[PDB]
């Protein structure tokens, strides 16, 4: 409930109070399972096609007369039991995008961030690098002072470009704006590191 | 996601052909003609586990009948006299005393002759 800000190469300067109606929602796994599934459905590109027996090139005529040969009657050279012929009930290009209600999406993000904050996994900082030119060597050593884990979600504002560029190629660090938080990326990450400009711009969008 | 069928399909082909060793002709070389015989071979086996309990009894009765007629009694009046005396030996062991111990079979025929009634044709 009481999260304190840590400065790069320093100590605690302030504190941020987390609201109970935004960071202490109970966990609902079946609600979170539908939301996370509906997100990864929307990431599928769905570009996969085949050809049915009318799209396959040629194959229009009847290959021989029906009666009198001792062959089976066939009707087309691209009927689907032929080698090289059409495909029956094949994949066509689809769109996987579920229309999940707004109150179900927003009550899984609050339930995942509550589970992080209930276990002491929300960290507030003020900036990643102390200056204006980026440096990955200084950003890596500062995140190791906070967390010693493999998955970290660094949530910073969009105008902060020096802190963004300082953690782009670290293995296991994902960057997203505060108004782009979603349930899949918060449940993937073992730790969430908010910027204080980012956490105050998330509480103020939910009162 | 296209799935080739070979890794799944070859698991029932091997256990049919491994269970069809010893069969002659196409019934041990080809999968389609060996699945048919395994339908017949496992039906006959079910048929014969239940039928071999009355083939051995058919063999046990035929040997007791032979060992009773050397001690001049029939199989008919031997089962009657053993039940009338209260001897509950099954026909498996009564047709194994008939071979492995012929002198104790006679001591049972002499008990099935004493408990048998005085006139076996008289009404009871």
């Amino acid at each position: 409930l009481k999260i304190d800000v840590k400065t790069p190469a320093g100590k605690v300067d302030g504190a941020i109070e987390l609201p109970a109606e935004l960071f202490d929602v109970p966990a609902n796994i079946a609600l979170m399972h539908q939301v996370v599934t509906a997100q990864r459905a929307a990431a599928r590109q769905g570009t996969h096609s085949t050809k049915t027996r009318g799209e396959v090139s040629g194959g229009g005529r009847k290959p021989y007369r029906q009666k009198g040969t001792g062959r089976a009657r066939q009707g087309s050279t691209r009927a689907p039991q032929f080698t090289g012929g059409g495909v029956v009930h094949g994949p066509k290009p689809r769109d996987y995008s579920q229309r999940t209600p707004k109150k179900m999406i927003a009550a899984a993000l609050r339930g995942a961030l509550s589970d992080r904050a209930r276990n002491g996994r929300i960290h507030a900082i003020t900036e990643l690098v102390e200056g204006q030119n980026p440096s990955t060597k200084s950003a890596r050593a500062f995140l190791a002072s906070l967390t010693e884990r493999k998955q970290v979600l660094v949530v910073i504002g969009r105008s902060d470009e020096a802190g963004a560029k300082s953690v782009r190629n670290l293995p296991g660090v994902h960057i997203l704006a505060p108004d782009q938080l979603n349930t899949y990326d918060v449940l993937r990450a073992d730790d969430v590191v908010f910027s204080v400009e980012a956490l105050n711009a998330y509480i103020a969008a939910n009162t | 996601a296209r799935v080739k069928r070979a890794v799944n399909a070859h698991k029932k082909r091997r256990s049919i052909l491994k269970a069809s060793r010893g069969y002659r002709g196409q019934r041990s070389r080809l999968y389609r003609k060996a699945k048919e015989q395994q339908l017949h071979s496992l039906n006959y086996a079910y048929r014969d586990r239940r039928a071999r309990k009355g083939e051995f009894r058919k063999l046990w009765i035929a040997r007791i009948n032979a060992a009773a007629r050397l001690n001049d009694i029939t199989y008919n009046r031997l089962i009657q006299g053993l039940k009338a005396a209260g001897v509950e030996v099954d026909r498996k062991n009564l047709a194994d005393i008939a071979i492995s111990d012929p002198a104790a079979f006679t001591a049972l025929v002499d008990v099935a002759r004493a408990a048998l009634p005085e006139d076996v044709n008289a009404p009871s």
Partner: protein, 144 residues
């Protein structure tokens, strides 16, 4: 904490599909059809009874016309004015929309089922007959 491998759906929300025509241990060769007739290869329409004159041509048509110029009225009972507005006051067409008793952008009509004990001052289109009796009995008024 919660991870992506602790998220399973609720019990009963997801039952497996019925794949058909996949061997004799399930719905087997005919796939639940069994026939040799029409139902084994096609559908039969709902509008067809085999040749006799169907149920949608035996019976006569329902009588009448439909008024092209019919004016409808959304409806609130006077026993819902009591529960929603227990102290009374000015009850307009806009305050019944926001309290969730009538729809948006529609002509309203106040009917009279319930018990009105509050002293309301209700403004609406086209009051009822038993509704004006219960509003003025509580000391109110009823204007168009």
């Amino acid at each position: 904490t919660l991870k992506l491998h602790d998220l399973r759906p609720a019990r009963g929300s997801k039952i497996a599909r019925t794949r058909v025509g996949r061997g004799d241990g399930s719905k087997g060769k005919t796939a639940g059809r069994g026939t040799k007739g029409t139902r084994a290869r096609k559908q039969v329409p709902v509008t067809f009874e085999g040749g006799q004159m169907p149920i949608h041509m035996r019976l006569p048509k329902l009588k009448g016309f439909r008024n092209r110029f019919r004016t409808e009225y959304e409806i609130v009972n006077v026993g819902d004015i009591n529960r929603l507005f227990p102290q009374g006051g000015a009850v307009g067409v806009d305050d019944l929309v926001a309290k969730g008793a009538v729809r948006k952008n529609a002509l309203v009509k106040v009917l009279g089922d319930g018990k009105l004990t509050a002293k309301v001052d209700v403004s609406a289109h086209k009051f009822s007959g038993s509704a004006r009796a219960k509003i003025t009995a509580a000391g109110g008024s009823a204007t168009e």
